[PDB]
Design a protein around this ligand. Structure first.
Ligand SMILES: Cc1cc2nc3c(=O)[nH]c(=O)nc-3n(C[C@H](O)[C@H](O)[C@H](O)COP(=O)(O)O)c2cc1C
Ligand code: SF4
Ligand code: SF4
Ligand code: SF4
Ligand code: FES
Ligand code: FES
Lengths: 435, 164, 139, 121, 239, 115
């Protein structure tokens, strides 16, 4: 077994046109290997595709990391009276995350063929893609690919000459981050406000229009045809055990060369940033903190980052998470309290307001953080702030409340001394007026 | 196992009500009013034995017959007598001696205890059984998952799909 | 019938309930009256107030008892430290934006919020920020 | 099918219709239903202030009507009724958006009136 | 909720009241009826968000009460549901805006790259703050959350409402300095078309970065996918 | 704790808002209150009686009031010749407050540090 991970070859990258350098039409995609042997893969069977996706070790690229093969197997196998639906999540409103924009803009035929593969794998008759409403050109490119796939008979009745029927449609939102949640996405797709449902029931039991439904990420869907053609053993040869495969990483912030780049999983952060991105602005010793997985996961300081692998089972043990693998880098000129305060403002702004702890407490967290930025607080209010985050987390309907508690927990845990110094030194400009 | 309000002084109240010799005390009809020493026309009035229903303004159930074994909930009530206004101030005047004594002080665990008190005191009584709450929900919205079921508008027809 | 009444355990007491009943209905059949704000007997279930949170064995999170169905052999706990902490926290979130209006409010004396704050909530607040103000509506 | 109902042809007794207690502008729309109890009905008193004040004395409602609305910068105002918060009312947070000098917002404790020129208007 | 919309209730205006009329043209009605066919007939209400978006370009960048009532009658749903959807989502403007809607991202990955200096440059040039329209009716300044363009931070999106539904453009402008956004605004004001995307590279490929929000600093290094693209390939699916 | 009195704001509006807390706490039941809404929408009393021959002069009403409307002022010299002169209605209590307002405010400027 390999011990050192990283330095993925160009011949092993799935997304060979992530930069849009080549021809974007269906002839360019078909010459680059897309829509190849699709009828033969569909003719293998539903159970075969489920088994092949199970053996690959591919986990959910949406941010939770559930195994995709077992998730797709939750759909029913027989007929009861209701059709089944595939829904593909292309919201991508996570701060820092811009991989699905590239997949939808530059490689949409991989997404469309993966939609066909997943719909056949789950018995689904129709499919919907929920693209972000801010992504207008990405929606246009996806619709061009869908029209091209209809014109060659890849989608529809007798799809790819296989006998299975599958239709694909495009829906788009109107600017809500909460519509990335599964049941909230179903509720917005049904023609309502994007407010999540309580589980149970589960979307594979009762989903869109009361019918069995699976919601999957764009990057999860798009890598499936390459996995089926090149094999599950090829995909699982990358990364650690239970952490298989390749991953798109977005590196943003105080970095010399910000980049969306594909790489093997279980690569170190320092390797992933120094190569492929030109390193930290001002050297690695100018690093202050790094959020490794978007915005919903806690930050890490410089000591944890030097050594930790960008992996599901490695960031979690470092009291963080991989999430969407969106990397945000701050340097020593950053006011980290101000950065997490703007994150608190984001989570206040994006709360859907359905349940009591999220709706009332995200504004409270923002007010406390705004006072902490100026140092206009008390030292025990830090422990109060931790208690309030523990009151929100685990107590709400959906996981946006946990995603609102988690950055403040990481800020307190790794920079409590900075917060205490900000409180203490503010009295050098506030207690000179009291006397 | 047995645990029915087994952490308070009410354990020491349920027994001391079943002490032998004192748990079988009984009197004849109207006899307790003769020895009560109150005027005998008081027992010509009518009483009602009933358990009051839950208030519509609130959702709690503590003052109902649901917690009948835990808390005394049965009441004795009397009909109103004349009231008028005071000419000098406007305050409400009355000549009723039983104006608040049944609603403030007389509470019973069961219906039969209040009946026994009325029988030994000589009050003629009418008993009103409270209306029983129903717990089973409607067929629509029986569970939370029926909010999102196929009963909203039927199974969706797949006739507007591309390729029909 | 295939055992149309299923048995659950509420605070280690066996309770028989009809099938399709929620956790809150099982708590009600055990003689426990769970605090609630959005649940109603005559309405559809919403699950948004988070006041009915109880603890179920082998579940690491508090469940919303109004919406969660009751399974066979389920073990429900309504008086653990996490249930009481959940109740106090949800009440504190309910009261930060509420107006100090009890003298001029007509529900004062028969208010679910007042009585549930007195019984299942704390006695203090730590909130000193400005509240949300809303204009009134004509109906 | 389903013909409309004409509410204007519904008869109302003239004794009942001329005795509806309504409100001036204040804290409501002008002309909506004013809650009343039975006190003063035997003496034929339909007015709130006349039920306890006798004579041509200046009423408290006429005192508060002589204090002009107060211009406040912001979107929400906190009303205590005093400079010292211990000596006034419980704090009332009053919305100020959509308010002007002609249509100000009123405190439900004190009757003081506030408005703001900050809601892009 | 967005900027420019401080009310979640309807306020009567001479421009915006129940007496105001809205009706679709022929081509816009064709577009709306084509949108409706994507969904089942008994779940026709699924089409509300794209139809309301198309109505927003048709009406000129914002939704009026008459437009919302027309959409409610068209989809056979109660108007309060339409008001719920229109007030819930950020892109739906419910007050009258300018011809071009300038929206700047303010979330932390754009904030580290100096979005505040771009906001300062826009306010110094156009003379308006966030939530305001210019006196000429040309530009409306707004604030947005993360727009999914964080590797090309800091960025601005600009919406074009001068051509109706057929010529609607929602264009991202990325990797900006104060000079770049001033030039883009001047190009729009003069009648030209500024270049879309990043102002110093093509896409999210590795190149330099904006240093301090004021100067692009190019940097060389390892770039992937520089060779020939991969050939088609499939393993033997039999055994 | 002397003669009971009803207070105003500096504008001239009554502080009392008919919450009926002082009527509920009164152990002697010496307070009788009726209310409805005023013509400007305000919540104000139409009757506020204090039976001074039923009062025990405990001050519990002063403690229960959340807007400092009812007080016990510094007057102890209020003996009368008829008992009907000691059944105070709302108008006389407001007249007492208008008489004693400056002294009551001076007293409450010290006693607000403790209460
Ligand atoms: C607040 C919130 C926002 C989310 N946003 C996204 C998103 O933008 N894209 C996405 O794929 N999943 C998002 N998710 C996760 C989805 O709920 C779901 O778990 C995921 O899309 C399933 O895809 P998978 O195949 O990767 O498991 C979000 C979840 C939450 C709680
Ligand atoms: S946690 Fe926040 S976003 Fe999720 S349902 Fe509750 S209020 Fe809505
Ligand atoms: S001082 Fe005591 S007796 Fe007098 S009104 Fe107040 S509570 Fe009643
Ligand atoms: S005097 Fe004070 S306590 Fe008594 S009714 Fe008036 S406001 Fe309430
Ligand atoms: S009663 Fe409100 S969440 Fe269950
Ligand atoms: S933070 Fe600006 S595009 Fe994401």
């Amino acid at each position: 077994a390999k011990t050192s991970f990283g330095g993925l070859k160009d011949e092993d990258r799935i997304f060979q046109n992530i930069y849009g350098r080549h021809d974007l039409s269906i002839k360019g995609a078909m010459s680059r290997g897309d829509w190849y042997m699709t009828k033969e893969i569909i003719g293998k069977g539903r159970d075969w595709i489920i088994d092949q996706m199970k053996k690959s070790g591919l986990r959910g690229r949406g941010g939770a990391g559930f195994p995709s093969g077992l998730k797709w197997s939750f759909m029913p196998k027989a007929s009861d009276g209701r059709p089944s639906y595939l829904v593909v999540n292309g919201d991508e409103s996570e701060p820092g995350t811009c991989k699905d924009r590239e997949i939808m803009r530059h490689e949409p035929h991989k997404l469309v063929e993966g939609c066909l593969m997943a719909g056949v794998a789950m018995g689904a008759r129709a499919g919907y893609i929920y693209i972000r409403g801010e992504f207008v050109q990405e929606r246009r490119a996806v619709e061009r690919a869908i029209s091209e796939a209809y014109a060659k008979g890849f989608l529809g009745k007798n799809a790819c000459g296989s006998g299975v029927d599958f239709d694909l449609m495009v829906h788009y939102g109107a600017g809500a981050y909460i519509c990335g949640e599964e049941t909230a996405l179903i509720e917005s797709l049904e023609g309502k406000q994007g407010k999540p449902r309580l589980k149970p029931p589960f979307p594979a039991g009762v989903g869109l229009y009361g019918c069995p439904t699976t919601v999957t990420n764009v990057e999860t869907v798009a890598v499936s045809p390459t996995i089926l053609r090149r094999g599950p053993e090829w995909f699982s040869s990358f990364g650690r055990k239970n952490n298989a495969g390749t991953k798109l990483f977005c590196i943003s912030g105080h970095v010399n060369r910000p980049v969306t780049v594909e790489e093997e999983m279980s690569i170190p952060l320092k390797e992933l940033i120094e190569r492929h991105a030109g390193g930290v602005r001002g050297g690695w010793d100018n690093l202050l903190a790094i959020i490794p997985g978007g915005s919903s996961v806690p930050l890490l300081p410089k000591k944890i980052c030097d050594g930790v692998l960008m992996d599901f089972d490695a960031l979690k043990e470092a009291q963080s998470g991989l999430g969407t693998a969106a990397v945000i880098v701050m340097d020593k000129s950053t006011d980290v309290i101000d950065a997490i305060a703007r994150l608190s403002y984001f989570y206040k702004h994006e709360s859907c307001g359905q349940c009591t702890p999220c709706r009332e407490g995200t504004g409270w967290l923002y007010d406390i953080m705004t006072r902490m930025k100026k140092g206009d607080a008390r030292l025990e209010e830090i422990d109060m702030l931790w208690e309030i985050t523990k009151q929100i987390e685990g107590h709400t309907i959906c996981a946006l409340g946990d995603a609102a508690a988690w950055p403040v927990q990481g800020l307190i845990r790794h920079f409590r001394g900075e917060m205490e110094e900000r409180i203490k030194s503010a009295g050098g400009k506030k207690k000179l007026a009291a006397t | 196992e047995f645990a029915t309000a087994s952490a308070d002084y009410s354990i020491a109240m349920k027994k001391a009500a079943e002490i032998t010799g004192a748990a079988e005390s009984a009197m004849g009809p109207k006899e307790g009013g003769f020895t009560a020493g109150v005027p005998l026309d008081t027992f010509t009035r009518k009483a009602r034995i009933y358990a009051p229903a839950r208030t519509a303004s609130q959702s709690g159930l503590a003052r109902t017959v649901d917690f009948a074994t835990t808390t005394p909930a049965w009441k004795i009530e009397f009909e109103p007598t004349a009231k008028w206004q005071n000419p000098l101030m406007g305050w409400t005047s009355s000549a009723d001696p039983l104006e608040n004594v049944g609603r403030s002080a007389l509470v019973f665990y069961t219906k039969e205890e209040a009946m026994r008190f009325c029988e030994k005191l000589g009050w003629e009584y009418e008993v009103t059984e409270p209306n029983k709450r129903r717990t089973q929900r409607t067929k629509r919205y029986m569970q939370y998952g029926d909010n999102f079921g196929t009963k909203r508008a039927g199974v969706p027809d797949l006739s507007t799909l591309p390729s029909n | 019938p295939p055992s149309d009444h299923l048995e659950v355990f509420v605070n280690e007491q066996p309770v028989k309930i009809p099938k399709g009943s929620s956790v809150l209905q099982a708590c009600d059949a055990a003689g426990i009256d769970i605090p609630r704000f959005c649940y109603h007997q005559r309405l559809s279930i919403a699950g948004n107030c988070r006041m009915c949170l109880v603890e179920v064995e082998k579940v690491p999170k508090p469940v919303a008892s109004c919406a969660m169905p009751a399974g066979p052999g389920m073990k429900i706990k309504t008086e653990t430290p996490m249930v009481k902490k959940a109740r106090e926290g949800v009440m504190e979130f309910l009261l930060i934006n509420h107006p100090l209006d009890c003298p001029i409010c007509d529900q004062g004396g028969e208010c679910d919020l007042q009585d549930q704050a007195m019984i299942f909530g704390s006695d203090r607040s730590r909130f000193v920020e400005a509240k949300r103000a809303v204009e009134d509506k004509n109906l | 099918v389903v013909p409309t109902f004409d509410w204007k042809k519904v008869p109302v007794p003239s004794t009942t219709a001329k005795d509806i207690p309504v409100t001036v502008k204040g804290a409501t729309p002008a002309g909506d239903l004013r809650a009343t109890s039975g006190l003063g009905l035997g003496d034929g008193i339909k007015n709130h202030t006349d039920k306890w004040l006798d004579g041509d004395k200046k009423s408290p409602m006429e005192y508060i009507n002589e204090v002009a609305p107060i211009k406040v910068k912001g979107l929400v105002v906190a009303s205590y009724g005093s400079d010292d918060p211990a000596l006034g009312c419980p704090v009332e947070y009053i919305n100020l958006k959509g308010t002007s000098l002609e249509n100000p917002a009123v405190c439900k404790y004190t009757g003081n009136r506030y408005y703001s020129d900050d809601w892009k208007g | 909720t967005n900027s420019t919309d401080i009310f979640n209730i309807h306020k009567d205006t001479p421009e915006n009241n129940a007496a105001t009329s809205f009706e679709f043209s022929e081509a816009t009605l064709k577009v709306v009826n084509d949108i409706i066919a994507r969904y089942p007939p008994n779940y026709k209400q699924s089409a509300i968000i794209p139809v309301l978006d198309v109505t927003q370009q048709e009406n000129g960048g914002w939704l009026s009460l008459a437009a919302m009532n027309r959409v409610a009658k068209l989809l056979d749903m109660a108007p309060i549901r339409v008001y719920e959807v229109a007030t819930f989502y950020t892109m739906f403007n419910r007050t009258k805006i300018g011809k071009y809607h300038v929206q700047i991202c303010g979330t932390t990955p754009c904030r580290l790259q100096g979005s505040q200096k771009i906001e300062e440059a826009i306010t110094k040039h156009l003379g308006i703050g966030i939530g305001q329209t210019t006196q000429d009716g040309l530009f409306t300044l707004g604030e947005m959350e993360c727009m999914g363009a964080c590797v090309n931070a800091p960025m601005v999106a600009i919406a074009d409402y001068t051509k109706g539904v057929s010529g609607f453009e929602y264009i991202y402008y990325e990797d900006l300095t104060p000079k770049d956004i001033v030039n883009i605004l001047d190009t729009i004001k003069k009648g030209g078309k500024p270049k879309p995307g990043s102002q110093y590279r093509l896409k999210a490929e590795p190149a330099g970065a904006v240093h301090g929000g004021e100067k692009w600093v190019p940097k060389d290094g390892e770039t992937t996918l520089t060779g020939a693209p991969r050939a088609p390939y499939c393993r033997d699916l039999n055994a | 704790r002397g003669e009971h009195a009803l207070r105003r704001y500096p504008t001239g509006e009554e502080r009392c808002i008919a919450c009926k807390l002082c009527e509920a706490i009164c152990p002697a039941q010496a307070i009788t209150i009726e209310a409805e809404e005023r013509e400007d929408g305000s919540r104000r009393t139409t009757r506020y009686d204090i039976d001074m021959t039923k009062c025990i002069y405990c001050g519990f009403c002063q403690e229960a009031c959340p807007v400092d409307a009812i007080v016990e002022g510094p007057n102890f010299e209020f003996s009368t010749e008829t008992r009907e002169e000691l059944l105070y209605d709302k108008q006389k209590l407001l007249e007492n407050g208008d008489k004693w307002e400056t002294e009551i405010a001076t007293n409450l400027r010290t006693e607000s540090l403790y209460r």
